[PDB]
Amino acid sequence: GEELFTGVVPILVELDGDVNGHKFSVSGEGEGDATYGKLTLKFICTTGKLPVPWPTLVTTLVQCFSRYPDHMKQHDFFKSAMPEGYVQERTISFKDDGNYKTRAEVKFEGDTLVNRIELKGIDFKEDGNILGHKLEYNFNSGNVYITADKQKNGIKANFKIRHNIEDGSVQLADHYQQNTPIGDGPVLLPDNHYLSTQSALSKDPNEKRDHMVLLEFVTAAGIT
Ligand SMILES: [Zn+2]
Ligand SMILES: [Zn+2]
Ligand SMILES: [Zn+2]
Ligand SMILES: [Zn+2]
């Protein structure tokens, strides 16, 4: 699967979500260049106004574009599952608030890497930082800690995202993640390691739709 990522790969993202009964959809398009751990995407809410803050969707909205250093190539599960793909499931628990449960299939459709997601959010506070839109439009750098899940022929990840609240505080979003291959072939089961991420959120000045432009760089580290 790593062979599929030596060049620039078009990406499509499609999400359907329901947060406390507020249904919405997001479509994204862009490209990835895993050689450089680089992603550039534009996401649009196709149903109107997004009912949650864009930063809370960043992690849900293709870790196969991570740059794995040559010395860690044997630990890249994500590319090894391609093209048939993988299922990526998360529970994202927002401290003192609700949670998202996500299910995604990440796979090739022809030359395009597609991330198709269903998101369900429950138990959110109408006056909280998420439904109340009190989060800043930015995204902090962080680490994603990966371990093998041999019994499921996949991986698990754990990490904490810290969303900045407008008043100066932070909204923690605890992430628990499981990935399992869709095809019945072999994959790479990694040693413990992490992914180091940085992300820049912007706007398209001519876009009147509710949207997010995202530039992300991700690099694997942790094994020498
Ligand atoms: Zn609504
Ligand atoms: Zn990301
Ligand atoms: Zn505000
Ligand atoms: Zn601030």
CA terminus-to-terminus distance, the chain = 23
Quote the number of domains for the chain. 1
Task: Among the bound ligands, name the one nearest to the CA of residue 165.
Answer: 4
- Outline where 15-144 has alpha helix (H): 77-80
Radius of gyration of the chain (CA): 17
Nearest-angstrom CA–CA distance, 151 and 16 = 30
Between the CA of 212 and the centroid of ligand 3 the distance, in Å, is 16
Between the CA of 50 and the centroid of ligand 1 the distance, in Å, is 10
Q: Would you say how long the chain is, in residues?
A: 224
Token pair in block for residue 205? 């000045």
Between the CA of 78 and the centroid of ligand 2 the distance, in Å, is 14
Residue 149's CB is within 10 A of a number of other CB atoms, namely 16
Between the CA of 165 and the centroid of ligand 4 the distance, in Å, is 6
Nearest-angstrom CA–CA distance, 33 and 59 = 18
Question: Shortest CA distance to 192 belongs to which of 145, 224, 151?
Answer: 145
Token pair in block for residue 213? 């432009």
Q: In which residue are the tokens 């597609």 written?
A: 114
Question: Shortest CA distance to 158 belongs to which of 148, 171, 144?
Answer: 144
Between the CA of 185 and the centroid of ligand 3 the distance, in Å, is 48
Q: Which domain holds residue 94?
A: 1-224
Q: Tell me whether strands 112-122 and 9-19 are parallel, antiparallel or unpaired.
A: parallel
For residue 186, the domain's CATH number is: 2.40.155.10
Solving technique for this entry? Answer: X-ray
Which helix (H) or strand (E) segment holds residue 23: the answer is strand 22-33
Written as one letter, the residue type at 39 is L
Say if CB 43 and CB 26 are below 8 A apart.
yes
Between the CA of 28 and the centroid of ligand 3 the distance, in Å, is 24
Q: What Cα–Cα distance (Å) separates residue 136 from each residue in 69, 124, 171, 209?
A: 33, 18, 10, 19
DSSP 191: P
Say if CB 43 and CB 53 are below 8 A apart.
no
64 Cα distance to chain centroid: 10
Between the CA of 119 and the centroid of ligand 3 the distance, in Å, is 24
Question: Shortest CA distance to 172 belongs to which of 130, 113, 215?
Answer: 130
Between the CA of 166 and the centroid of ligand 4 the distance, in Å, is 5
Nearest-angstrom CA–CA distance, 185 and 196 = 28
DSSP 72: G
